[PDB]
Write a protein that binds this DNA or RNA. Structure first.
Lengths: 127, 96, 98, 114, 79, 59, 206
RNA sequence: CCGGCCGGGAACUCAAAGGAGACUGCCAGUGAUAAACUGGAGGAAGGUGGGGAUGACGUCAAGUCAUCAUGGCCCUUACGACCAGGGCUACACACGUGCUACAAUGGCGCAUACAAAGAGAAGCGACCUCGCGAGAGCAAGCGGACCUCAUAAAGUGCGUCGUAGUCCGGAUUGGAGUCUGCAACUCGACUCCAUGAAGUCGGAAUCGCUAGUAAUCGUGGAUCAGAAUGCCACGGUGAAUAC
RNA sequence: AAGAACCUUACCUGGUCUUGACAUCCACGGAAGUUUUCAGAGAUGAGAAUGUGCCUUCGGGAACCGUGAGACAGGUGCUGC
């Protein structure tokens, strides 16, 4: 298949193309280096793009949709796991063992009434 | 209760909507000058209750000054009564 | 080209109505687009339950406008003769567009 | 480059040296900044007469320092001389712009006294 | 603190001030409205501003031109 | 050309269309929209529809 | 005090909405105020007609009001003259053409609002409240509802200290959402004070 | 036009309807051969999957007669009713709640990223022109998956500051645009140009939080002519620790 | 209080009350209305110009407007014990 994006994390659904050769991430027909190359936390989110280990013979074009950067990395990671299962079902045990096939269902909780945030409660005076 | 306030609100809505707000609009577009003033003095002469900003929104069932919800047209307690009864269409308890 | 837009507060009502319009288009035989699901507009109202002092005590409310577009490709005089009171649902508000 | 102040720039910004000079707001600083257009944290050695003349004419063209002290003191003073309440109510020191005085305004009222 | 499309004065106050100038001498012109800017036509007149049951007499000088009638009336009483 | 002059506020009733035997009053016309705004009662339901002389055949 | 309205919590799942129309933001408050005035006129004119629910459904131009009534004869009147006077009346309140249809409330001892106004009118006519409540619960249990709970509140039997007395038979599973529970409240303006009657009737599990 | 833009296609994201799925279903070990517990496979989710809505009989004669209804009592040429200016915004101070701080894990400047949820017709208002600017002029598109609010900010990448009381920004009346012109005096928010206070991490004490949580960063809505640092929602980054 | 510049909005001044701002009646008169002039801080007065259409089995009926007496209104007045 054409290695299109699948897989979701937080508010992100993946839109990446991966194709054989050597790898350099380019986004919206523009470079990762021009956009965000030497960015810190970008190594932290580039590592899950490669944690699927399915980069070693490929080229990367990323224009994923939704969320922020780490959520986008989670969606791209889940997508390369799905691409791997669809391509050959053999590494399903190792991908589940690494924990990559699980969709991270952790999502932000709603603001609740009488509470300033989801769980944070207004300061209480005893007297 | 508070029947005078509803009579007052009736008077302001009647002066603003029907008697005026053609004259007041023409006076305001003259009053902004673009290349003491007669239009401002005529706008002074027009009655005070003709201003739309003197209308205070009131509950249509009770006339409560505070707590009005303008989609329903009622204050919060009457809205809750009609929602629980079923009189407000499509309104149910949100549970997201 | 004649696109019909349908809004309701009840999804069962709007499915029954969009089936009636889609069946009418099929009975004429002109091409129709499907009942296209356009996003539900949800309005949330948070009203205080107590008349007096209780701020934290509130209850939440939602109105859901369900929406569907049917978009008849070819208008027909047999359709236009049959359209009169074809919806027959008070909950469904229908807006045609040429 | 001291014109109508107690502060002379000392290897620092002209715009904040004038800003530390009383009676002058930020826009005269901004205008002299646009006139300069270099780093102003360059040294004060060879202070430029061009900078001295430009800042003097610009503070002269806009509101001059000391009119602020004049405005407060004479507004209080002449409405006291007339006996109108505006001089007294500007004299007492509580803020008249509209700030609450029920629990705040300690900047105008100093430290608390019981 | 006001638009530059127009200066503001009450129309009854403008009429009463121009009648005061046409008379050339007047007693305190009792004005209930405080939201009126002092005109240069007001200088040399005594305008009596309303602040409740007390009655404040304000005599215009040349300084108090851009200011309204209200700031020369004390609204509240303090120790 | 039949009825080439266009008059605002003119009432036409289409027997073939669903608006037959229906009476309505047009208080507001949106000239700034550049589409004729009448609360046309369609299928026995009165809702505002934008309309044009090219869009609907005049009766 | 701590209890949710059963109709309100069940308004989409089991119970139907009383007013069924679509309105945008311009027509919503006007439609609802017209509805409150239509319901108030119909209640006060049909106080003796045993009214249960008023269902208002409008296709924008027209208005249709369906009155659920235990006695259709009194509201229908002589050859529809009474219904025609209410039709002209609802037309003048609504400002749009009206049509009034009539639904018969078979088994009025199961309907909540009807047994509520029965206990309320009895309490006005000085029937003892224990007797009226026991008559209501036994009549509903006899006619075939699975459960009935009747709560009376305030100034009971001409006493200064208010009390709330509830008589319960069968099941009223209020916490479950499937249960069709018609709940209604009626208000008695007795000479010593206001007495409030609350009825829940659990007819089946849907 | 290298803009899905455009033929096309419906394949994905997606929208919103209907289903499937998770029940200790399966396996082991324990237990009493029971309920059940502890692990494991599968699976997206595993043992209330996460959160919401749901608050039993009653308690405090708890709160609301001022949302509305209401028993009794009182006023009815006044305790009714209209108007204009005032007060609810005052201040010797003392508590409870939130904002911004006390910098360098930060400021300032430039360039560049990635979102969700809402609202909108006497409304949302692009675009272009003119303003340091709040804004003004002209004004298309829109009752909305279309147009508009609306180039998210934290993030980053280069500089620069390396005590500066810093952009932390409090402070009377000045110079202005807007709202409604009853009308910004008392008493609007706003780039305001006003002067650059206090504070160098806070005594006794005391509060919130167990995972997408705290913390931090923005966005929207109701109320509303204008008037949030409040309330109600929304997403971004994302801990520490439970012996 | 999901919004105090006026309004909201009770509490000091100027006017009003037997129909009150707000409903229902009864009598009389006038279409309702729109444009203005003077006075006043202002609902308030004091005036002019036009509109008697609409309709009644015209022995004149309207939504209304104003006045005149009584029932009545009106109360964000008290007691959540």
């Amino acid at each position: 298949n054409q290695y299109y994006g699948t897989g979701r994390r937080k508010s992100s659904a993946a839109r990446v193309f991966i194709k054989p050769g050597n790898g350099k991430i380019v986004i919206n027909q523009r470079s990762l280096e021009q956009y965000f190359g030497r960015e810190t936390a970008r190594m932290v989110v580039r590592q899950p793009l490669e944690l699927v280990d399915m980069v070693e013979k490929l080229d990367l074009y990323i224009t994923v949709k939704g969320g922020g950067i780490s959520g986008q990395a989670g969606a791209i990671r889940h997508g390369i796991t799905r691409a791997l299962m669809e391509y050959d079902e053999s590494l399903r045990s190792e991908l589940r063992k690494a924990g990559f096939v699980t969709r991270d269902a952790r999502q932000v909780e709603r603001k609740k009434v009488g509470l300033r945030k989801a769980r944070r409660r207004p300061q209480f005076s005893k007297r | 209760a508070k029947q005078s306030m509803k009579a007052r609100e009736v008077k302001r809505v009647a002066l603003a909507d029907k008697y005026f707000a053609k004259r007041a609009e023409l006076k305001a577009i003259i009053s902004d000058v673009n290349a003491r003033w007669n239009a401002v003095l005529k706008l002074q002469t027009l009655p005070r209750d003709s201003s739309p900003s003197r209308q205070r929104n009131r509950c249509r069932q009770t006339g409560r000054p505070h707590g009005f919800l303008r989609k329903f047209g009622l204050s919060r307690i009457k809205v809750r009564e009609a929602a629980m009864r079923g009189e407000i269409p499509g309104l149910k308890k949100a549970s997201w | 080209r004649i696109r019909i837009r349908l809004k309701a507060f009840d999804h069962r009502l709007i499915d029954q109505a969009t089936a009636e319009i889609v069946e009418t288009a099929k009975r004429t035989g002109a091409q129709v687009r499907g009942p296209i699901p356009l996003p539900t507009r949800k309005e949330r109202f948070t009203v205080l339950i107590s008349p007096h002092v209780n701020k934290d005590a509130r209850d939440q409310y939602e109105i859901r406008t369900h929406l569907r577009l049917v978009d008849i490709v070819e208008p027909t005089e047999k359709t236009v003769d049959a359209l009169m009171r074809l919806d027959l649902a008070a909950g469904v508000d229908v807006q045609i567009s040429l | 480059a001291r014109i109508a102040g107690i502060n002379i720039p000392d290897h620092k910004h002209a715009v904040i040296a004038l800003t530390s000079i009383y009676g002058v707001g930020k826009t005269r600083s901004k205008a002299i900044l646009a006139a300069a257009g270099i780093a102003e944290d360059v040294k004060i050695s060879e202070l430029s007469e061009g900078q001295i003349d430009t800042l003097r004419d610009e503070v002269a063209k806009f509101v001059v320092e000391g009119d602020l002290r004049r405005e407060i003191s004479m507004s209080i003073k002449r409405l006291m001389d007339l006996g109108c309440y505006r001089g007294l109510r500007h004299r007492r020191g509580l803020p008249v712009r509209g700030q609450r005085t029920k629990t705040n305004a300690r900047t105008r009222k100093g430290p608390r006294k019981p | 603190r006001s638009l530059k499309k127009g200066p503001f004065i009450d129309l009854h106050l403008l009429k009463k001030v121009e009648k005061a100038v046409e008379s050339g001498d007047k007693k305190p012109l009792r004005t209930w409205s405080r939201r009126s800017t002092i005109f240069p036509n007001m200088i040399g007149l005594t305008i009596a501003v309303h602040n409740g049951r007390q009655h404040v007499p304000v005599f215009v000088t040349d300084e108090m031109v851009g200011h309204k009638l209200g700031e020369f009336a004390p609204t509240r009483t303090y120790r | 050309r039949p009825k080439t002059l266009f008059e605002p506020g003119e009432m036409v009733r289409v027997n073939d269309g669903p608006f037959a035997d229906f009476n309505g009053v047009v208080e507001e016309v949106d000239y700034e929209k550049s589409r004729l705004k009448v609360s046309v009662s369609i299928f026995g339901r009165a809702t505002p529809v934008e309309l044009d002389f090219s869009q609907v055949e005049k009766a | 005090g701590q209890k949710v309205h059963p109709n309100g919590i069940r308004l989409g799942i089991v119970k139907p909405w009383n007013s069924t129309w679509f309105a945008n933001t311009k027509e919503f408050a006007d439609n609802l105020d017209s509805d409150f005035k239509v319901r108030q006129y119909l209640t006060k004119e049909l106080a003796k007609a045993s009214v249960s629910r008023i269902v208002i459904e409008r296709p924008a131009k027209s208005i249709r009001v369906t009155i659920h009534t235990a006695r259709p004869g009194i509201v229908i009147g002589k050859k529809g003259e009474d219904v025609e006077k209410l039709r002209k009346v609802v037309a003048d309140i609504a400002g749009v053409p009206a049509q009034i249809n009539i639904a018969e409330v078979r088994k009025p001892e199961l309907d909540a609002k009807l047994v509520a106004d029965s206990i309320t009118s009895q309490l006005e006519r000085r029937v003892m409240f224990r007797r009226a409540m026991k008559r209501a619960v036994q009549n509903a249990m006899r006619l075939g509802a699975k459960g009935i709970k009747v709560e009376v509140s305030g100034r009971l039997g001409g006493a200064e200290i208010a009390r709330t007395e509830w008589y319960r038979e069968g099941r009223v599973p209020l916490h479950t959402l499937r249960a069709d529970i018609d709940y209604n409240t009626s208000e008695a303006h007795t000479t010593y004070g206001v007495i409030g009657v609350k009825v829940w009737i659990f007819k089946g599990e849907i």
